Amino acid sequence: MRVLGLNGWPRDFHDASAALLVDGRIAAFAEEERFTRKKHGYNTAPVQAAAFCLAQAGLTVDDLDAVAFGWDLPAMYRERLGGWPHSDSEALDILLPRDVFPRRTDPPLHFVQHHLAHAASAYYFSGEDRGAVLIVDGQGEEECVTLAHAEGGKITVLDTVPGAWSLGFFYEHVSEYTGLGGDNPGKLMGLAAHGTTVDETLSAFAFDSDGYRLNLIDPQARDPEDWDEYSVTERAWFAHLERIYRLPPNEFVRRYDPAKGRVVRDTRRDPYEYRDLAATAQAALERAVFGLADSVLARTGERTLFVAGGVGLNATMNGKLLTRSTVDKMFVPPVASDIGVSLGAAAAVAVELGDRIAPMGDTAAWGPEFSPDQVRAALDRTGLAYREPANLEREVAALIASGKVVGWAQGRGEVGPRALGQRSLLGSAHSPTMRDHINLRVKDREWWRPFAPSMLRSVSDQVLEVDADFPYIIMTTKVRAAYAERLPSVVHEDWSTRPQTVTEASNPRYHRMLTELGDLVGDPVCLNTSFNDRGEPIVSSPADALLTFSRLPIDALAVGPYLVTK
Ligand SMILES: Nc1ncnc2c1ncn2[C@@H]1O[C@H](COP(=O)(O)OP(=O)(O)O)[C@@H](O)[C@H]1O
Ligand SMILES: [Fe+2]
Ligand SMILES: [K+]
């Protein structure tokens, strides 16, 4: 079967994406924001992402066996907005506008339950027969947590928790409160490391062996003027935090900066001041999730754990789950946030149709790639001089080894929040100054933010103390003694890191580059941070990369077979 999964709706949505499964395999997969250049893919069908998928696969909607959506959208409309007004054709006309997607007839349209869709994106691509499923996000249609069982093709829901007790929402509001912003929980995760946990209950959570209990909010509490309990949980949390925490909300500040020539946003306080509140929001989250994980594992008698939902992006929480006593094996897909429920809905549908879903295979390079001719066009358009180095990987490794920062734009763009060697900014893992250089001089961002290393899987074994695939930078782990002090820019004081392991299969060109680096600095390890400027998505097109390369003091840009310097 050919199944096009979708996420993103014009009204009140985020992280639109489109994913194409063809006979179990991922033909194409991309996030709308990469094409629009507007962060987060807000309020829209994944028009361009879907456009790209069909084009990649060489298909029209008429070649499609099914279009799947990653929410029970008609059900949300019935429940929260009093009426699902559309016909499956009027639905498809909004999701796949007729002027971009011409069709002889509507394909079958499936709505897949939101958490099932998350669960699908973890299970069917993990490469494991069975396990415990733990879905933890902001909020699907009603629930905010799902504990389910994955066995022989089937996912079976055991229990759920209602939206008012969301831990995604909880985390977000703390994120907002700190001045970090609700749309930057990752930054909060990052800040935590610098904090000191005081009272992990925050005077709200009561923890137990199965999870948590939230006496601050009525669990059946619900918003009349909406279709999720965000605004509800917001008032409750914000009111609570100001009672118990020594600082009031950080407020955002809108002023005209005569140096920028714009009205820019800023925060009244330095968000670093809330590091204690951050350290504590993190600890609360870990403690709640440790309980849920334990619960769903013991009920399924499983020992492989599947995690998905926005909270599954907490690489710090993931790492601690991993080392947990109750966990032997664990899979969290790179697309654990909503961007994944396209892929998830498609999989759930493909499986119903008798398809067999193939494992991701330690890669997420499912977006757009570009011909050397196409790249050449983008360069020739700019009039910059460039080279076609005989051995791009060797020269690229030499630049990195010497402490220069290199823009790396190669192959199919990677899907998800984290760059994985398709669209990366690369630098020395070995440099004691690289971190402050990239954070402060290169990206103009907070000094306290961390960086993640890319290493050959073939030496993962000796660098990290867990001989396991870490393909997505979505799980923290500890480096071994021998490497703790060698990799100053990618290993915390803690000795923890968020690694990407690389295989020759997943990325021949990059694997080849790290290898060359090895011969230069001894370890085939490097710094690997997202390729973009403060307020943009990771770059997608060669034009996208030139543009960004233009306003960053990077040293060189390896885009396609071409090297460009400064
Ligand atoms: N690093 C992180 N740590 C903890 N929570 C996170 C992190 N990244 C994202 N989240 C949570 O993901 C939630 C949203 O999950 P997602 O499934 O993408 O959307 P929705 O809940 O709308 O379906 C947010 O409320 C946010 O708190
Ligand atoms: Fe979700
Ligand atoms: K273990």
**What is the 3-state secondary structure of 3-67?**
EEEEECCCCCCCCCEEEEEECCEEEEEEEHHHHHCCHHHCCCCCHHHHHHHHHHHCCCHHHCCEE
Structural contact between residues 216 and 316, judged by C-beta atoms closer than 8 angstroms: no
- 223 annotated ligand-binding residue: no
User: Which residue is closest in CA terms to ligand 1's atom 26?
Assistant: 168
Mode of pairing for the β-strands spanning 525-530 and 423-428:
antiparallel
Could you list which residues have their CB under 5 Å from ion ligand 2?
137, 338
What single-letter DSSP state applies at residue 258?
T
Alpha-carbon span 365 to 414, nearest angstrom: 4
Structural contact between residues 8 and 17, judged by C-beta atoms closer than 8 angstroms: yes
Contacts of 504 (CB under 8 A, 6+ apart): 511, 512
Which atom from ligand 1 is nearest to the alpha carbon of 309? 17
Written as one letter, the residue type at 114 is H
Resolution of the experimentally solved model in angstroms: 2.9
- 215 annotated ligand-binding residue: no
Q: Is 171 in the pocket of ligand 1 (CB under 6 A)?
A: yes
Torsion of the alpha carbons at 485, 489, 495 and 499, rounded to the nearest 10: -120
**Residue whose C-alpha is closest to residue 174's, from 127, 236, 129, 116:** 236
**DSSP letters for 387-415:** B--TTHHHHHHHHHHTT--EEEE-SSPB-
Q: Is 314 in the pocket of ligand 1 (CB under 6 A)?
A: yes
The three-class DSSP label of residue 564 is: strand
What single-letter DSSP state applies at residue 316?
H
User: Which residue is closest in CA terms to ligand 1's atom 9?
Assistant: 310
| Ligand 1 centroid – CA 168 distance (Å) | 5
User: Which residue is closest in CA terms to ligand 1's atom 3?
Assistant: 314
To test the pocket of ligand 1, the residue of 42, 71, 72, 137 to mutate (highest count of ligand atoms within 8 Å of its CB) is: 137
**Residue whose C-alpha is closest to residue 91's, from 179, 6, 182:** 6
- 139 annotated ligand-binding residue: yes
Q: Tokens standing for 199?
A: 């009272």
- Domains of the chain from N-terminus onward: 1-112+341-360 (3.30.420.40), 113-340 (3.30.420.40), 361-565 (3.90.870.20)
| Ligand 3 centroid – CA 322 distance (Å) | 6
Which atom from ligand 1 is nearest to the alpha carbon of 169? 25
Residue by residue, what is the 3-state secondary structure of 273-311?
HHHHHHHHHHHHHHHHHHHHHHHHHHHHCCCEEEEECHH
Method by which this entry was solved = X-ray
Structural contact between residues 282 and 320, judged by C-beta atoms closer than 8 angstroms: no
| Ligand 1 centroid – CA 330 distance (Å) | 19
Which atom from ligand 1 is nearest to the alpha carbon of 170? 27
For residue 325, the ligand closest to its alpha carbon is: 3
Which phi and psi (to 5°) does residue 299 adopt? -80, -25
Q: Is 312 in the pocket of ligand 1 (CB under 6 A)?
A: no
Q: Is 228 in the pocket of ligand 1 (CB under 6 A)?
A: no
To test the pocket of ligand 1, the residue of 13, 226, 313 to mutate (highest count of ligand atoms within 8 Å of its CB) is: 313
147: left (phi over 0), alpha (psi -120 to 50) or beta: beta
Which atom from ligand 1 is nearest to the alpha carbon of 315? 1
Alpha-carbon span 498 to 322, nearest angstrom: 13
Residue by residue, what is the 3-state secondary structure of 133-202?
EEEECCCCCCEEEEEEEEECCEEEEEEEEEHHHCHHHHHHHHHHHCCCCCCCHHHHHHHHCCCCCCCCCC
| Alpha helix ranges (H) inside 434-540 | 434-436, 457-463, 481-484, 508-521
- The yes-or-no answer on residue 173 being catalytic is no
For residue 229, the ligand closest to its alpha carbon is: 1
Which phi and psi (to 5°) does residue 488 adopt? -45, -35
Q: Is the dihedral of CA 257, 260, 263, 264 positive or negative?
A: negative
Structural contact between residues 114 and 145, judged by C-beta atoms closer than 8 angstroms: no
